[PDB]
Write a protein that binds this DNA or RNA. Structure first.
Ligand SMILES: [Mg+2]
Ligand SMILES: [Mg+2]
Ligand SMILES: [Mg+2]
Ligand SMILES: [Mg+2]
Ligand SMILES: [Mg+2]
Ligand SMILES: [Mg+2]
Ligand SMILES: [Mg+2]
Ligand SMILES: [Mg+2]
Ligand SMILES: [Mg+2]
Ligand SMILES: [Mg+2]
Ligand SMILES: [Mg+2]
Lengths: 214, 135, 149, 65, 64
RNA sequence: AGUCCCUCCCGCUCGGGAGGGAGGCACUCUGGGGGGACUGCCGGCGAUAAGCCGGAGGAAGGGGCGGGCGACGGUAGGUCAGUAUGCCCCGAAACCCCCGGGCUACACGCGCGCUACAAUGGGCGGGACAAUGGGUGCCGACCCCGAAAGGGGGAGGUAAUCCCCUAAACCCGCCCUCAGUUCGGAUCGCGGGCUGCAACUCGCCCGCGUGAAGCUGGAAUCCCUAGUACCCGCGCGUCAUCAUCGCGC
RNA sequence: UGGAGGUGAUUUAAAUGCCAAA
């Protein structure tokens, strides 16, 4: 099936998964620039040494962040697109090899369909899916009200990554699409500001509700 | 006729590496490193060699014996042992700082170990507990 | 080149193909109707699974010998689905392994060490190493780093 | 339309119903009111040198103690 | 919190008054000296005492 | 691991492997003793004190990390059905034995779990890598017979020596393509075994057949801050036989 | 240090005490 040149692939340079270089990738958003890490690195697996220290997740390569984000079940205690998604024994919890394979196949599909460097497309997606205004809640007279506030860049990045992963998770659930295809579809749609993307629609709704409560 | 031996540990896996002058063959428990599977484990072992460069890579031979642990734990111990062997054999300080910039753990190791379990659902973990009911 | 230089599964496939020319390897009469263990669910789907099992057993004896029936029964077991109960490990049965080892001895590839098990004779070692050398010659045409080994 | 970047220069303190909000002082980097210093409410972790994107620059948060 | 213990302070102050010209601003020297001038048998307590004595020496050398 | 002798393999052997013997304690390991971290060094805040915040160096940094040890008392909290013990009772039955039943019943309400509702999969063949513990009323390699569950002989072991003991999740190839299905495996028929003095009431295992509800779950509500939570198997206790449990790995 | 006065305000709903003790 898969050719032997792919089963036994050997790199010779420090580049992401030995296949794509990140030298020409640039970040437009001035706020997200010092939080998207793009230093050269061969293997995106750092064995969770960053969770101890405050702000330590800043210096973690963005591909590894995506891999960690999709390594989940998806819909445990809140509904996504109108449903709980409890996979349990058939989820991706603590299976980081399978997540690595999913991300690799998604990158190959992205490169085939659009002809561009997949890291660049991913950066565009997270730029378009990062909200700029959020809201907090107050209670009065037994009724709950919203008040608009601003968002720090780290939280923007976290929310964008989680929403992309959730959209991909919802698109392949009990349908003929596969996980890698859904992830590719979601990233491409978010990169083109298409409302059919879950992440972009979520960002629009969040910002609209925040605006209507200044 | 130089010989150097080094040791690496990672959560119950122990690796012993021997380095000598050679033509560039690296073996893990007698298997060529190019055939190690899965891929995510093959790249764990090869990182220090790529960082060192092809000139140093092709002038040595390394044999690694590793036991205990799991497939991911065994690869990381071998990586630690190989990095220490490379820095000791050539004895150049530009490389030692280069390893530290990329990944400190290559040279100082990882001290984490499992935490022993405690009662109230002891088989699941030290902190996971049984579901609580009031009626 | 030796067995240690090539992937296991590819070698097993080549050896299984090669074992069909040796007259002493013939699947028994009850081969069409059996599962390969109590932990399985359905019968084997390959019409020539016997040769695959024999090739695997021969490679096993080459690497871990001397070895007996019981340890091989451990090696060919696995996890079982038990309805509403949690899954569990079980061993395989013994007839397939015993008959395969006897046929391999009849062909002269293994011999018996008393109280210890079965070991690979020089003929069997040559037989496996020849196929390993040929497979490596094929393989290094697309992985140039394999030429050093 | 694309907002205005501002830069955090001082942390004042936590607030909100559950302590989830921080009050900061920012200096506008772009637009009509470049250079002005105003205080704002931020959600999420923040440190000196972060850059916020404001959708409007004429609202100022009520000072906390 | 790293609050120094009472008996550590008491023994350290007794040592400082009795042998004023015996301790310097160096931690190793004081470690050995305390090890020899008392019957303390725990390695940890010895380190605490030596550290406090070092602080006393630097504080009196400043003149408070 | 290096050095030496013999034997056997491959590309016929310059080279590369595997066993055995001499030989060594290098490396891993085992376990006695010792070293190492003290807010000790540096810059701020606080009072110039107690301390706090941030840096270097470091295997480790600020109770270094995880455990044992629970003050004076209260709860008329639980236990006389573990043992000790006052009073009241039975004292030819409320004491001591034996046989057969029951604690396993079944319109229904509730707690804690396991298996699922599928592709972040099901099946078939092949390839990988553990740790804790336990063994003489016992652990049993190795050979033979049987399709399986099992049956007949039986080395070594009172154990860093012999045995339980070549884990599963994971990886590679082929079949199935969104369906109450090659998802699920409850219920029942027939046949074969083991333990035991005894298997119907009322045990556990294997083969062929059979093929229920279930297509993600209202109002509510639980656990968890790092080698932690989730996911995956294994050991011991109980034990003649029996683990969807307890304590650990 | 400890007291005495004055003017302003104070973000929905939320009733009850049974077996016991004897
Ligand atoms: Mg655990
Ligand atoms: Mg298997
Ligand atoms: Mg299952
Ligand atoms: Mg009481
Ligand atoms: Mg009471
Ligand atoms: Mg009962
Ligand atoms: Mg099925
Ligand atoms: Mg019965
Ligand atoms: Mg369905
Ligand atoms: Mg019980
Ligand atoms: Mg009342």
């Amino acid at each position: 099936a898969k050719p032997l040149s792919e089963r036994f692939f050997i790199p010779h340079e420090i580049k992401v998964m030995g296949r794509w270089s990140t030298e020409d990738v640039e970040v437009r958003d001035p706020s997200l620039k010092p939080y998207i890490n793009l230093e050269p690195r061969l293997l995106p697996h750092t064995h969770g040494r960053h969770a101890k220290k405050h702000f330590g997740k800043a210096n973690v390569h963005i591909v590894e962040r995506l891999i960690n984000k999709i390594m989940r079940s998806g819909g445990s205690h809140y509904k996504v697109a109108g449903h709980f998604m409890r996979r349990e024994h058939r989820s991706l919890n603590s299976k980081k090899v399978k997540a690595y394979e999913v991300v690799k196949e998604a990158f190959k599909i992205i490169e085939k369909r659009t002809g561009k460097n997949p890291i660049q497309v991913l950066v565009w997606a997270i730029e378009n899916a990062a909200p700029r205004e959020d809201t907090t809640s107050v209670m009065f007279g037994g009724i709950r009200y919203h008040v608009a506030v601003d968002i720090s860049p780290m939280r923007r990045l976290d929310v964008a990554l989680r929403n992309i992963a959730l959209g991909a998770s919802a698109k392949c659930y009990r349908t003929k699409m596969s996980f890698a295809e859904a992830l590719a579809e979601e990233i491409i749609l978010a990169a083109n500001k298409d409302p059919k993307s879950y992440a972009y629609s979520k960002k629009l709704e969040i910002e609209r509700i925040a605006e209507s409560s200044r | 006729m130089r010989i150097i031996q080094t040791t690496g540990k990672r959560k119950t896996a122990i690796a012993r590496a021997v380095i000598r002058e050679g033509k560039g063959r690296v073996r893990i428990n007698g298997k060529p490193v190019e055939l190690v599977e899965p891929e995510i484990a093959r790249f764990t072992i090869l990182e220090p060699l790529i960082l060192a460069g092809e000139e140093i890579w092709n002038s040595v031979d390394i044999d690694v014996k590793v036991q205990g642990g799991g497939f991911m734990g065994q690869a990381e111990a071998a990586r630690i042992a190989i990095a220490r062997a490379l820095v000791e054999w050539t004895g150049d300080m530009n490389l030692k700082e280069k390893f530290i910039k990329y990944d400190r753990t290559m040279l100082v190791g990882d001290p984490r170990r499992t935490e022993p379990h405690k009662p109230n659902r002891s088989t699941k973990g030290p902190r996971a507990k049984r579901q609580k009911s009031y009626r | 080149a030796t067995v240690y230089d090539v992937p296991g599964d590819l070698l097993v496939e080549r050896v299984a193909q090669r074992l069909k020319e040796i007259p002493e390897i013939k699947p028994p009469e009850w081969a069409p109707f059996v599962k390969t263990g109590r932990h399985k669910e359905r019968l084997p789907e390959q019409e020539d699974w016997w040769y695959y099992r024999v090739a695997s057993i021969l490679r096993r004896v080459y690497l871990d010998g001397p070895v007996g029936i019981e340890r091989l029964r451990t090696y060919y077991g696995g996890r079982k689905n038990r309805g509403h109960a949690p899954e569990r490990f079980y061993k395989a049965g013994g007839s397939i392994i015993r008959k395969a080892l006897q046929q391999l001895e009849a062909a002269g590839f293994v011999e018996k060490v008393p109280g210890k098990g079965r070991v690979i004779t020089p003929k069997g070692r040559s037989f496996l190493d020849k196929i390993a050398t040929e497979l490596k010659k094929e393989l290094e045409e697309i992985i140039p780093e394999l030429k050093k080994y | 339309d694309e907002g205005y970047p501002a830069e955090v220069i001082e942390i004042i303190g936590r607030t909100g119903t559950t302590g989830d909000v921080t009050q900061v002082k920012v200096r506008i980097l772009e637009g009509r009111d470049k250079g002005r210093v105003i205080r704002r409410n931020v959600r999420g972790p923040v440190r000196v040198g972060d850059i916020l994107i404001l959708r409007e620059t004429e609202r100022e948060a009520r000072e906390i103690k | 919190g790293k609050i120094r213990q009472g008996f550590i302070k008491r023994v350290a102050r007794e040592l400082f008054n009795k042998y004023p010209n015996e301790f310097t601003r160096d931690f190793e020297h004081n470690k050995k000296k305390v090890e020899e001038l008392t019957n303390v048998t725990s390695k940890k307590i010895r380190n605490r005492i030596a550290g406090y004595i070092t602080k006393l020496v630097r504080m009196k050398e400043e003149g408070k």
